[PDB]
Design a protein around this ligand. Structure first.
Ligand SMILES: Cc1cn([C@H]2C[C@H](O)[C@@H](COP(=O)(O)OP(=O)(O)OP(=O)(O)O)O2)c(=O)[nH]c1=O
Ligand SMILES: [Ca+2]
Ligand SMILES: [Ca+2]
Ligand SMILES: [Ca+2]
Ligand SMILES: [Ca+2]
Length: 901
DNA sequence: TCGGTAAGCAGTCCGCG
DNA sequence: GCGGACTGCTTAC
């Protein structure tokens, strides 16, 4: 097999590399790598190395990496550019793996672990590590085993061994329900003392050294705790055995308001799963406890126990250990679904970076561009210091707030990357500038044509047309990968809808789910077989189709995020290729493209309808337009359609056969006007929306910019079994909105769009009457909580104290003195409830850590004093009033002359 | 929360005769 | 009471 790296580090003058050799074995080597850097040289000097602008360079080979670093410093002292890859390990990988890396995940040791630490006096601080580690569960992907290290004797209690037999039993048998599929994979090791436990764990780690190390909060808790505890008991040298090269560093992570410490383990790649999830999931959750995320992702129930976690080991050691094991498994289950480790490996090996560097789009693109340029013996520029400067972004149209009955939307494919490719925007393709007219003049095609030679953006920049820049070349490669995965995602989505339709008529039989590839549209033969399947088999197939869609979504949306990240990196001062001329060339071209095509679409539809000056485009944001289709439907007449699907078909065909060719002609003209390199503005129909045929539903409404709701029948070629609400920006979509209120507001919207005013009034009346019975957690608001200290004046709110922070201060006074009460953590999320006048907490609200029940001490008083009237007005009535006023509807029935009968 | 801009709403403070 | 200046937080792209 072809060799591939696992990890790489620089330690002084050596590169330490772990890798898989040509025979598939894991090896380690230390290499005295001699790096090269570059200086500009005279034109009359033979070289094969050129910078990105075509100026000749001489290569300087150093005796060691320290010599190279010192040379960079002296070049700064002189005032001359020091060119080349200054991150020597990236250069090492580029020289050692000079081909497209083909990796074999089965050879990569991925470890998932979790620790338990009993603590009487609050949260066990990892930097102190003053309490025994009393359990470790460590799953190894190569062994496919859960290694369980269990402390039986502690200063906080002596316990009996954990029983695998009880662990396996149902909770209704008094068991812990450890999933049967992992029971045979557990290797249980009990210990008489903590010193022996940790010594054995280190010997185990030496034998089975993680390449990828993951788990939940491992970077901020488990790793520093284990390192510091071993340090405290045995000394520094022993703790450093967690690194295969015996090297560690305390790293200070700084933010806006403070800092924290993590431990860097040289020769390991730590990918904390909470951080993978936050980067790659595109969710914003009210809590990031593993129980909360597990319930959201997997629909598994919360891990139930009695009393505080600090007393769990002593009271129920059996459950304590089972729950440690289950926590490790839940992370593996989330990854089986979301496939974030797979994604990280794919992108890391593609770029040729340390795998943990996938968190940084700047580092990722630096490496991709470096490797690409090196292939042509070109030499990268030195990174420079720049002051942070604001720059302009997208255009968003101000919509007229209203109901909109029939709507079709259109959207540009991969806009910012397509602009980069069309215009040919790159550091080395800058050709010069032209004299800019107001943007309006380009939009309306009255400005002078910018150039007869170069490719232009309306910010004034011109670009070469003779050859593609490196940024367009490399962005195209990742875009093509994205396109492939998006295809699989959409096919799985369409396949899912076929199964949903079939589920209306399930067959009374015993059979099996079909063995199919859900990434490809079902054949006619498969469709025929599906129509004969049982509900059991169909539901299994739906679950599998949906898992295939999730896998495709992970792969496509994150490749989209990477290519959009390159457009953004051009506007980040830490990027080697930072240039506001290029960042603004992208965003300004986008503003023009949207407004240009709004004009062309209005012109086309006014012509087909025989009117003048009427606005068909009701809204647009960045690269999308929303078109009123009422007049199109009315030209046919509603009574002429057989059912909803009939007019949906008609609009689908109108969009494809009439509107898209008109849009294409419009953009081709724009490409010629700007003299661009290649026409790549591809705007296809996205949504077809409207009320059910014959209903009193309103179809859709807008309240303002980035705030609308549509009843959608077809999305990007997926024809839904049931209409789907597309809601953007409204409170239903915000993590700050109470869970039960999101649900109620969504039902109000559904009723408005699908059924009409009377239906809305009926539901509102019921919600208002019953909502006080809702569980307190479900009606609590949520907020991140920063700067608690800034606003705390002797335990009371200082000037301008935010509402949620006020709630935290209230909580802190109520729990004062208690060492075991859950503390609110700076920067994390809290639940918030309003309090009625004259409550014993002495303020108008209270807040506590999100994802948790409020502590028993004050729970009774919180429930008794919760202000339901304020809660309802603020979270439900006010947003609903906004929706209904915009849609010209009433949520309460107004008096009529009929009330007289 | 270590890792592009536009823009909405909640809440504080305070003016507005 | 509602709007502007401002902070804080959270979305849509
Ligand atoms: C979603 C998103 C968009 N944008 C910018 C760049 C996008 O090209 C532009 C439009 O966003 P989108 O229409 O969401 O995305 P897209 O056009 O890149 O891709 P698709 O093919 O799925 O339509 O907004 C960002 O800069 N960052 C982001 O996270
Ligand atoms: Ca735990
Ligand atoms: Ca788009
Ligand atoms: Ca059937
Ligand atoms: Ca869009």
């Amino acid at each position: 097999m072809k060799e591939f790296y696992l990890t790489v580090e620089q330690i002084g003058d050596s590169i330490f590399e772990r890798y898989i050799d040509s025979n598939g074995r894991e090896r380690t080597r230390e290499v005295e790598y001699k790096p090269s850097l570059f200086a500009h040289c005279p034109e009359s000097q033979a070289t094969k190395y050129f910078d990105i602008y075509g100026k000749p360079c001489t290569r300087k080979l150093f005796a060691n990496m320290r010599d190279a670093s010192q040379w960079i410093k002296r070049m700064e002292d002189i005032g001359l550019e020091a060119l080349g890859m200054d991150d020597f390990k990236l250069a090492y990988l580029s020289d050692t793996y000079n081909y497209e890396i083909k990796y074999d995940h089965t050879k990569i040791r991925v470890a998932n672990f979790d620790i338990e630490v009993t603590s009487p006096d609050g949260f066990p601080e990892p930097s102190q590590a003053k309490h025994p580690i009393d359990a470790i569960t460590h799953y190894d992907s190569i062994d496919d085993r859960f290694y369980v290290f269990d402390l039986l004797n502690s200063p906080y209690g002596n316990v009996e061994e954990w029983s695998i037999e009880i662990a396996a039993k149902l909770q209704e048998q008094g068991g812990d329900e450890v999933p049967s599929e992992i029971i045979d994979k557990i290797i249980y090791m009990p210990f008489d003392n903590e010193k022996e436990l940790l010594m054995e764990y280190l010997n185990f780690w030496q034998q089975k050294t993680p390449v990828i190390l993951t788990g939940w909060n491992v970077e901020s808790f488990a790793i520093p705790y284990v390192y510091n505890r071993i340090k405290n008991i045995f000394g520094e040298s022993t703790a450093k055995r967690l690194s295969p090269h015996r090297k560690t560093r305390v790293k200070v992570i700084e933010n806006m308001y403070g800092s924290r410490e993590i431990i860097t383990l040289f020769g390991i790649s730590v990918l904390d799963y909470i951080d993978l999830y936050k980067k790659f999931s595109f969710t914003n959750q009210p809590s990031y406890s593993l129980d909360y995320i597990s319930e959201f992702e997997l629909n598994v129930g919360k891990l139930k126990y009695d009393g505080p976690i600090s007393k769990l080991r002593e009271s129920n050691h059996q459950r304590y250990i089972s729950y440690n094991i289950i926590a490790v498994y839940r992370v593996l289950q989330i990854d089986a679904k979301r496939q974030f480790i797979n994604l990280s490996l794919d992108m890391g090996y593609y770029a040729k970076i340390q795998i943990q560097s996938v968190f940084s789009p700047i580092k990722t693109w630096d490496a991709i561009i470096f490797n690409s340029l090196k292939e042509q013996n070109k030499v990268i520029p030195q990174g420079r210091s720049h002051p942070v400067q604001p720059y302009p972004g997208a255009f968003v149209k101000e919509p007229i707030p209203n109901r909109y009955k029939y709507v079709m939307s259109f959207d540009l494919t991969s806009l910012y990357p397509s602009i980069i490719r069309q215009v040919n925007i790159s550091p080395e393709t800058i050709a010069g500038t032209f004299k800019v007219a107001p943007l309006h003049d380009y939009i309306n095609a009255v400005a002078e044509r910018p150039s007869d030679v170069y490719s232009c953006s309306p910010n004034g920049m011109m670009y070469y047309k003779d050859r593609d820049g490196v940024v367009p070349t490399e962005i195209t490669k990742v875009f093509n990968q994205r396109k492939e995965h998006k295809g699989y995602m959409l096919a799985a989505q369409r396949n899912g809808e076929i199964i949903k339709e079939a589920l209306h008529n399930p067959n009374l039989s015993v059979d099996e789910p079909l063995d199919v590839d859900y990434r490809f549209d079902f054949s006619d033969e498969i469709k025929e077989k599906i129509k004969k399947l049982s509900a059991k088999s169909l539901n299994e197939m739906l679950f599998r189709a949906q898992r295939t869609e999730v896998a495709g979504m992970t792969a496509q949306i994150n490749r989209k995020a990477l290519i959009n990240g390159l457009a953004g990196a051009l506007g980040n001062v830490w990027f080697r290729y930072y240039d506001l001329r290029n960042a603004t060339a992208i965003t300004t071209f986008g503003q023009m493209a949207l407004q240009w095509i709004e004009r062309k679409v209005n012109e086309y539809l006014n012509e087909v309808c025989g009117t003048e000056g009427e606005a068909f485009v009701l809204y647009g944001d960045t690269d999308s337009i929303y078109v009123s289709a009422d007049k199109i439907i009315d030209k046919v007449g509603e009574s002429k359609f057989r059912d909803t699907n009939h007019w949906v078909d008609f609009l689908d065909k109108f969009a494809r056969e009439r509107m898209e060719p008109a849009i294409d002609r419009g953009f081709r003209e724009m490409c010629e006007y700007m003299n661009n390199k290649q026409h790549l503005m591809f705007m296809d129909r996205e949504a077809i929306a409207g009320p059910p045929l014959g209903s009193k539903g309103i179809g859709g409404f807008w309240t303002g910019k980035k705030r609308y709701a549509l009843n959608v029948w077809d999305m990007e070629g997926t024809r839904y079994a049931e209409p789907k609400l597309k809601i953007m920006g409204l409170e239903t979509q915000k993590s700050s909105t109470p869970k039960a209120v999101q649900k109620a507001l969504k039902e109000c919207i559904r009723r408005m769009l699908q059924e009409g005013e009377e239906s809305l009034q009926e539901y509102f009346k019921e919600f208002e009457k019953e909502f006080r019975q809702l569980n307190y957690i479900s009606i609590a608001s949520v907020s991140s909580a920063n700067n608690i200290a800034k606003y705390d004046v002797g335990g009371f709110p200082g000037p301008k104290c935010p509402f949620h922070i006020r709630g935290i201060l209230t909580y802190n006074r109520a729990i004062k003195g208690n060492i075991d009460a859950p503390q609110v953590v700076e920067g994390e999320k809290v639940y918030v409830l309003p309090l009625r006048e004259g409550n014993p907490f002495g303020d108008k609200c209270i807040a506590w850590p999100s994802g948790t029940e409020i502590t028993d001490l004050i729970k009774d008083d919180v429930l008794h004093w919760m202000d339901y009237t304020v809660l309802l007005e603020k979270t439900f009535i006010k947003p609903l009033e906004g929706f209904t006023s915009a849609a010209k509807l009433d949520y309460e029935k107004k008096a009529s002359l009929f009330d007289m009968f």
